[PDB]
Amino acid sequence: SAKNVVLDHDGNLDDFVAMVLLASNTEKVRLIGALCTDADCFVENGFNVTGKIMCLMHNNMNLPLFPIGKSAATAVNPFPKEWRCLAKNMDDMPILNIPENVELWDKIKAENEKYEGQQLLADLVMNSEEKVTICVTGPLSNVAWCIDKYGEKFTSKVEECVIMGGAVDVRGNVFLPSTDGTAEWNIYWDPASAKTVFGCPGLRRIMFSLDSTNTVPVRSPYVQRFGEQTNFLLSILVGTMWAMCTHGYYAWDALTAAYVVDQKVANVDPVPIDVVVDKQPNEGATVRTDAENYPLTFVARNPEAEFFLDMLLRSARAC
Amino acid sequence: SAKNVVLDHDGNLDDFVAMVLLASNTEKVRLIGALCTDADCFVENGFNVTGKIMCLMHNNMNLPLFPIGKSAATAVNPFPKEWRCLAKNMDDMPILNIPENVELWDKIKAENEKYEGQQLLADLVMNSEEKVTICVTGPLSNVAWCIDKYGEKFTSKVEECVIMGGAVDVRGNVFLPSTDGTAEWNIYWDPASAKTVFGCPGLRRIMFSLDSTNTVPVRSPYVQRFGEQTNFLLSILVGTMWAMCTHDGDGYYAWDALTAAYVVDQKVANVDPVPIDVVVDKQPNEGATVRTDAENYPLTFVARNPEAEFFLDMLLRSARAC
Numbered sequence A: 001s002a003k004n005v006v007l008d009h010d011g012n013l014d015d016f017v018a019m020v021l022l023a024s025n026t027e028k029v030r031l032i033g034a035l036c037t038d039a040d041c042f043v044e045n046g047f048n049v050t051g052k053i054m055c056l057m058h059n060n061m062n063l064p065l066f067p068i069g070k071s072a073a074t075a076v077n078p079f080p081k082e083w084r085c086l087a088k089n090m091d092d093m094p095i096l097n098i099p100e101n102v103e104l105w106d107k108i109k110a111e112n113e114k115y116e117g118q119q120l121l122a123d124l125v126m127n128s129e130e131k132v133t134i135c136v137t138g139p140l141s142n143v144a145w146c147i148d149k150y151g152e153k154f155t156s157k158v159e160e161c162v163i164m165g166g167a168v169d170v171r172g173n174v175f176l177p178s179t180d181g182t183a184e185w186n187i188y189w190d191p192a193s194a195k196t197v198f199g200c201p202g203l204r205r206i207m208f209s210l211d212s213t214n215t216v217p218v219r220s221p222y223v224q225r226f227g228e229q230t231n232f233l234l235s236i237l238v239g240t241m242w243a244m245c246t247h248g249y250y251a252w253d254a255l256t257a258a259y260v261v262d263q264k265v266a267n268v269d270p271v272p273i274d275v276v277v278d279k280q281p282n283e284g285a286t287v288r289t290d291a292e293n294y295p296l297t298f299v300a301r302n303p304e305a306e307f308f309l310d311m312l313l314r315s316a317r318a319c
Numbered sequence B: 001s002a003k004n005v006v007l008d009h010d011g012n013l014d015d016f017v018a019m020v021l022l023a024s025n026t027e028k029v030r031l032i033g034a035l036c037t038d039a040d041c042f043v044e045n046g047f048n049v050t051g052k053i054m055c056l057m058h059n060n061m062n063l064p065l066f067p068i069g070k071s072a073a074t075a076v077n078p079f080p081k082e083w084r085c086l087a088k089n090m091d092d093m094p095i096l097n098i099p100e101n102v103e104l105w106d107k108i109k110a111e112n113e114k115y116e117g118q119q120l121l122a123d124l125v126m127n128s129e130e131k132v133t134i135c136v137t138g139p140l141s142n143v144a145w146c147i148d149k150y151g152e153k154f155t156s157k158v159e160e161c162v163i164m165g166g167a168v169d170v171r172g173n174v175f176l177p178s179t180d181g182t183a184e185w186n187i188y189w190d191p192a193s194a195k196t197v198f199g200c201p202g203l204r205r206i207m208f209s210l211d212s213t214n215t216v217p218v219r220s221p222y223v224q225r226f227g228e229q230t231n232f233l234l235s236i237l238v239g240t241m242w243a244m245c246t247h248d249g250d251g252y253y254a255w256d257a258l259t260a261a262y263v264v265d266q267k268v269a270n271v272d273p274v275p276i277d278v279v280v281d282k283q284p285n286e287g288a289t290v291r292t293d294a295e296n297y298p299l300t301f302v303a304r305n306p307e308a309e310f311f312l313d314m315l316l317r318s319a320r321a322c
């Protein structure tokens, strides 16, 4: 049967496509909850879009409602405000504002806005009968908060943490006048938390760094294929989000969520991953460490691109 | 009976909302052509989005096809590289890429690709048995070319020019290190062409400067109402384009939409006659639309106190035409 999955995201466009993938593959994934972080989005918008997507799907296909929580995590190095506003735009898109669907969200909103994201992640993981796979598409602040507070009690409950983040053998994507371009954004947002997660013993981590995600870019011809499926709400939703990315833009979080759905997406290789926490040009960089007895992270490599793109197009036909 | 109308735009998000407004109101308007200018968009993209929207409406509400041409016009002062890229994102929207509509467009794209934007505008107006109303939502370069090239043979055929542009009694929106913020972007893109248009006698002009567009901003509650009409392709279309405009600041308005709304129904706003000249000298206020003292100076009818509720209701209704 399907495995338990919690999505820990920061509400940008690819975070939502990742959400769709997880929630539309009911045979492989049982999405038991989600949390949104005020990183690459303003959490109130990220929170509402999460809920609106969950209700549109729930009212049109097989998908049990699940808890959604706002994480109190705060930034160390914030995302450029320009990219963050994207959840706001999504929040106003017609396909996410069908009355019957918004109506549902309005009735269940009170319950969900009561949860605190980090504590909800700890609870969903620990109180689960089966182990829980965590799909992290935003910064690692939340998995770190759980580790710092419950240690082995939390980590022993995690099936595996499938993380979108870092740059191992390729350049990063954090280009500011104070950085050298070796770091990737999710790690850079909160380096200390990333260090805690990558250096945590007894936690299995799958890592989709820029090494894998650079090989699956957002391309117009493929994006137009969603036009062949306008009869499906999800194809209108997914095609519309990627239309705002194509112009530089990758399916970062989507590919990552695709792996949680089906491991065929990519093979993973063991690498001791440490994180630069100092205020230097390479702050947030993910580097190999040969330090004695350091935990091994399984880096994804050479992703099956066609397999992924096909998985997404077909999944966007769930409803 | 509908009146002939040609849309002269530059492919930004409101230009396309304006296009839908014009085309969807077939009772009041018969859209006989459109041209895209490489201004606040990249012409090729503006061109295809224009064609995909036309075809989609053709196969869903019987909107007669019409020639679409690319303007050869070039900038004097380029639009910010940031905004121009939007006609690009719209080109990949699922709603504009339905196979049947893409097929039709791919068929007729070669012949429309043949037209020269400026000449197309001249011919559509001069070869019409009835006069033609021109809706300009981009720079004034194309109407100016036609005036210069054909003069009275052209203007005498123009019912009226309804233009989105300028700022008369309020500040502009062009803020660069070298400007003073008094000019508006469409005029600033090509001041000389604008001067030509506003000074031309024998041509009737309706002007939607920021004075009127400032009074009808893009707000979330309203945009979300398009979600009440997802069974209409045009509501998915218009609702998505404006969803991209809901950003602290004032940001986006419905500049080009309000302008086309007037072409559909003059009830949209009252107009005031004002002699308008354009600053073409490379001064800080370059591109500013100013009141001139010249004698016998042709008057331009500036929009005042637009009916905001009337407009919002017109757009929501027009979007349910299919």
Ligand SMILES: Nc1nccc2c1ncn2[C@@H]1O[C@H](CO)[C@@H](O)[C@H]1O
Pocket: A012, A013, A014, A015, A040, A083, A137, A138, A164, A173, A184, A185, A186, A248, A252, A253
């Ligand atoms: N323009 C952009 N550049 C880099 C990263 C971006 C981005 N827009 C969103 N992201 C996010 O940053 C993380 C990838 O570096 C992803 O999880 C993704 O959501």
Ligand SMILES: Nc1nccc2c1ncn2[C@@H]1O[C@H](CO)[C@@H](O)[C@H]1O
Pocket: B012, B013, B014, B015, B040, B083, B137, B138, B164, B173, B184, B185, B186, B251, B252, B255, B256
């Ligand atoms: N952010 C922005 N600021 C100013 C003008 C803008 C804009 N985005 C688009 N425009 C365009 O500017 C002209 C309005 O000033 C309109 O025709 C419209 O298409």
Ligand SMILES: [Ca+2]
Pocket: A009, A010, A011, A012, A014, A015, A040, A137, A138, A253
């Ligand atoms: Ca993300």
Ligand SMILES: [Ca+2]
Pocket: B009, B010, B011, B012, B014, B015, B040, B137, B138, B256
């Ligand atoms: Ca325009």
